[PDB]
Design a protein around this ligand. Sequence first.
Ligand code: ZN
Length: 278
Amino acid sequence: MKLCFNEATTLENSNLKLDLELCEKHGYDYIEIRTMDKLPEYLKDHSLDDLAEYFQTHHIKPLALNALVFFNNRDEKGHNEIITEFKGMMETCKTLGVKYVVAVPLVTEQKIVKEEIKKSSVDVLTELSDIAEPYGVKIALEFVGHPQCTVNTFEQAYEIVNTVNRDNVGLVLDSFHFHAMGSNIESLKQADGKKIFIYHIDDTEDFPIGFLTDEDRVWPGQGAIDLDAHLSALKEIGFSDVVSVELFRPEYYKLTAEEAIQTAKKTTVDVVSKYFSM
Ligand SMILES: [Zn+2]
């Protein structure tokens, strides 16, 4: 299983240029690039070709672009924003050789029946799939374990992906999100491992579901998530391609970029290697 770094982990104490240097130095195989801040920032004094050249000349590679944000249940205008951004991301993936694009469900206070959220998510993901085919890029749906996220549990997200039924549409299994709204481990055990594109590892303080937010995450193994169950299930269903460490804890932004990157690696490797050869 390959090791990947998610820039959220050093959101406030690093930048893409530094993340690349340190992740490369510390044996990471992949990095997930943030499109809403890290990449634009990097592009202020670098070109996409510079970045493409970097990947061509170093071990580390770009696993995915992070977040086509709020793709489902949008009005005409919002849908336009989503499609326009995804089309733009396709060009970026092509230039940098990126394999995945993570998609995040709509977060809203509006109550929408599940069948409406499903129909919209399936229709939009199918449209994104159609767009991605000529680029060979795959879409990874990351359900978010938040009470205001329209798709917040594993089974709901899996049902959507299975209904889309496209080889280039899968899931991002994030341990925190799985735990955050109480997804059932049995649902994961019965899932097709091939539909899991990316595994985001993390952990969390033991607050009840509904109260949990991303700032509550802590390093893998230092929290209350039954990671043993998650890892055992992933192994059982055949997933084993990659694990990316994603944290949003303010506390860790107080560390240097390197301390965070090295700690993210050690905690992740020490937990995951008990189930997978890395
Ligand atoms: Zn995640």
